[PDB]
A paper describes a structure:
However, for these theories to be broadly applicable, they need to be demonstrated for large and multimeric enzymes that catalyze complicated reactions. The enzyme used in this study is a type II DNA topoisomerase (Top2) from African swine fever virus (Asfv), a dimeric multi-subdomain enzyme (271 kDa) that catalyzes multistep reactions to modulate DNA topology. AsfvTop2 has been found to be involved in the early stage of viral gene replication, and also detected at the intermediate and late stages of infection. The domain composition of AsfvTop2 resembles that of the canonical Type IIA DNA topoisomerases (Top2), including the well-studied eukaryotic counterparts, which form homodimers. The catalytic process not only involves well-coordinated changes in protein quaternary structures to allow timely opening and closing of the N-, DNA-, and C-gates, but also ATP binding and sequential hydrolysis that relate the dimerization and catalytic activity of the ATPase domain to the mechanistic steps of the cycle.
We first performed the cryo-EM reconstruction of the full-length apo-AsfvTop2 without DNA or nucleotide. Furthermore, these primary conformational states are each sub-classified into two conformers, a and b, exhibiting local differences. The distribution of the three primary co-existing apo-conformers is approximately 1:4:2. Even though such differences are modest energetically, they do suggest that the closed state II is the most stable state, followed by the C-gate open state III and then the open state I. These thermodynamic properties are reflected in their structural properties described in the following sections. The changes in the Ia/IIa pair are mainly in the closing of the DNA-gate via the WHD subdomain. Conformers Ia/Ib were aligned globally with two apo-yeast Top2 structures. The results from the preceding section suggest that, even though the global conformation of apo-IIa is very similar to that of EDI-1, binding of DNA/inhibitor still induces small subdomain reorientations, yet coupled with substantial catalytically relevant conformational changes locally.
Numbering used by the authors:
A (entry chain B), B (entry chain A): 716 to 1192
């Protein structure tokens, strides 16, 4: 959807350099390159929504670095600043680790009007369809979903990737019967409350402090995903609760929650004798709306087009791994396929220098008659600008247009390129990709799946980026 | 002065392509490149003054092609249009012929702030200091001078250049004694009047038609360099002439002069009995101001800085030829000097192919040790980007920085450049400049001065440009 359009425009805009760019300038840049004409304000609203970072927001970690005040938890991000003055910055550290740049070349792209368009789906290192809540880039329809905690998904992927994990075969065993032995619980970060589960439903509860010596009630923790002003109007809606309330003053503030509530002790005695004495929670936390029922709207984008429904978070996750699993296989095979093409290219040029001016002569260089002569010499008729510079080409079309290439990668070089010093750089390079080919050859042969070792390293890189972001003052330097 | 600044900016602006450019855009382009900050309006006024074309204007032929109405003879060019809307176009045909482009590289340039500036003086094919009247690019001081006819200067230069002219030795004889046998008379183009000379002063007279049958006086020709409104206020200044005038109506128009003047026959009888009966002109043309005395302000720009005064037009012309004469010598010698540098360059590359892969090996290409080895091979250590692309360099600095050049004009070429087909283009080229060198060698040896034949051809090119401009509707195509 529009989320993928902004992300691809963001990395393309800051590919040359990652600096400070105005949101309006960034919004126009995104719209210009992908012909997105749904509205600059709507696009800027989605950009702010994607780049917002507040406790309880739909995006736990923003795609772009948040510059300035993009919103607050009181209004649910509706108090964003003017896009003309405020700026946006791409998160170079996280996106590079989360989204593999070299894997972006192999994504399934769609083409319209003879120009590149957005991919149908992005498959990053971790499933972003779980860690992020529901959001509304458009108007009218609001998406609402609850994110799992950032510990259970890591245990799921690490067991599915690392060979030394004790729950490796058991995890694969659980896939066939869909028993889901591994646990999956909602998020807990930036929530100083309680999570309690009955049946198939989850509930969130806030924290309140009652002090007898000073007769002052202190509010500590707000619920998970309700606006502060929404909680205020919720307690001011009921007519009967007005008789129970004498004074309520809002002391909520950003990064500091300390609200004093005045309630006379005369009232506390008769609260518990007409509220049915609920067994789940006390009437003190029942009078104030601190409980939110959870009804997860679990959906995923259809690869063929459309929407799908799943019974549990496991079904979303269990189908996400094979898509990421196949991409690790594809990136290694294509890299191996293109690497050997560079091997024969460098060797042929070095062999050309061996049969150059110093030793042998092939200066005829005829078009058709010498084509067979050069064929007998063993020089491959491979085209340049493709092997040296790969592009959005898959494995099966790579060899077809490379073997049936063209010349001018030979006999059109600089006259200094056939020197001994120039040859030394070439012969010291041909071993480098040959050694790198051995590393790839050692991979793509593991029994579970190709590229298991790199997946663990990519997971560690994601963890390092998250820790560094939360350590400093959101500066990443 | 400012005239040279606009001309150099004009040719530089339209060097890539000659199209329609706005005067304000052209004025800003001139100011930007030469840091001319005397005022955009003043610069635009000078641009319009340089590009104006009206009968009796200071510039008989404008430097730039006149687009739109740049002025009129009635107000003396003071009725120019808005520079924002009107456009200006460079006269590519005339300036290329009048000002030799290849000779512009050898002009004496001054340098300020480490950047190129305007030349001290321009020496074109014909002396522009004679054919153009006086003008005021600035305010306050007005320059006034009278231009000679476009026939006498041609006879002067042709006799001084062409060998077959009968008045060749006699013209050179007149230089020593300053007798000035050749005639020099003021301009006559676009002037249907009379030129009459007494002593050392010249006078211009208009043409009037008097018809007896209809009793209507018709004005035919205005004086040479007076505004039409100036003539009107001149006849309305004298108090006594009001008694002599009954009705005067201005019928003057652009490209159509037909003015009817009403004067009763009763007045004609007593005009001639109180005006002293001037012998030079009749009282009919004496009552109306049709005579202008000539007091030429002959001046030329000092090469060392300042202004100079000359007694006659011959002294200005007799000093102008040696400056143009020396430049013809300089352009041929420098062209001959740089041409042989290109000869040895192409021959060395061809000889390099002869001693290339096919026959000989010199692949060591050491920096210091092989410098003597390549010296024994006869390969000249000349630097490229100077011989192939000449710049503003004189003869004496050309060889000093070319003989003490650097390599990479050899052993750094394309590998296809040593082919037989590539060699054929080089060996068919080396004879071309060698043949062209013979043409230059045949020149620069004539007894009068070098480059006499090209001067005659350049004169013919100037004549062709002038004829074509006046033939079509000022379109030059």
């Amino acid at each position: 959807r529009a989320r993928r359009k902004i992300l691809a425009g963001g990395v393309k805009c800051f590919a040359s350099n990652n600096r400070e760019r105005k949101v309006f300038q960034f919004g126009g840049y995104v719209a210009d390159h992908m012909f997105y004409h749904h509205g600059d304000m709507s696009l800027n609203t989605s950009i702010i929504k994607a780049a917002q970072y507040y406790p309880g927001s739909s995006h736990l970690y923003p795609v772009f670095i948040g510059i300035g005040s993009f919103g607050s938890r009181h209004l649910g991000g509706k108090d964003a600043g003017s896009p003309r003055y405020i700026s946006v910055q791409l998160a170079s550290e996280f996106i590079k680790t989360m989204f593999p740049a070299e894997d972006s070349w192999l994504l399934p792209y769609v083409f319209e009007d003879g120009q590149r368009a957005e991919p149908e789906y992005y498959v990053p290192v971790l499933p972003l369809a779980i860690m992020e809540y529901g959001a509304n880039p458009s108007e009218g329809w609001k998406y609402t979903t609850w994110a799992r905690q950032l510990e259970d998904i890591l245990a799921l992927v690490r067991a599915y990737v690392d060979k030394d994990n004790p729950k490796h075969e058991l995890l694969h065993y659980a896939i066939k019967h869909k028993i889901t032995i591994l646990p999956l619980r909602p998020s807990n970060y930036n929530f100083k409350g309680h999570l309690k589960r009955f049946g198939q439903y989850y509930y969130s509860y806030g924290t309140y402090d009652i002090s007898e010596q000073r007769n002052i009630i202190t509010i500590t923790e707000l619920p998970l995903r309700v606006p502060t002003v929404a909680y205020i109007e919720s307690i001011k809606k009921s007519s009967n609760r007005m008789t129970f309330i004498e004074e309520i003053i809002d002391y909520s503030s950003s990064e500091t929650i300390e609200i004093l509530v005045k309630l006379k002790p005369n009232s506390l005695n008769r609260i518990v004798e007409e509220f049915k004495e609920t067994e789940e929670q006390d009437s003190i936390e029942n009078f104030l709306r601190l409980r939110n029922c959870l009804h997860s709207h679990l959906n995923f984008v259809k690869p063929k087009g459309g929407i799908i429904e799943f019974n549990s978070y496991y079904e979303i996750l269990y189908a996400w791994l094979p898509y990421r699993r196949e991409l690790y296989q594809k990136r290694l095979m294509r890299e191996h396929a293109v690497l050997k093409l560079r091997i024969i290219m460098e060797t042929a040029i070095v062999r050309y220098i061996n049969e150059s001016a110093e030793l042998n002569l092939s200066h005829y260089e005829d078009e058709k008659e010498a084509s067979r002569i050069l064929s007998e010499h063993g020089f491959p008729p491979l085209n340049h600008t493709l092997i040296i510079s790969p592009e959005f080409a898959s494995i099966e079309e790579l060899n077809q247009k490379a073997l049936q290439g063209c010349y001018t990668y030979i006999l059109s070089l600089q006259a200094r390129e056939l020197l001994i010093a120039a040859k030394t750089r070439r012969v010291e390079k041909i071993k480098k990709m040959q050694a790198r080919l051995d590393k790839v050859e050692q991979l793509l042969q593991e029994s579970p799946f190709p590229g298991a070792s790199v997946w663990l390293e990519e997971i560690d890189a994601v963890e390092k980026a998250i820790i560094k972001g939360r350590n400093t003052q959101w500066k990443f330097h």
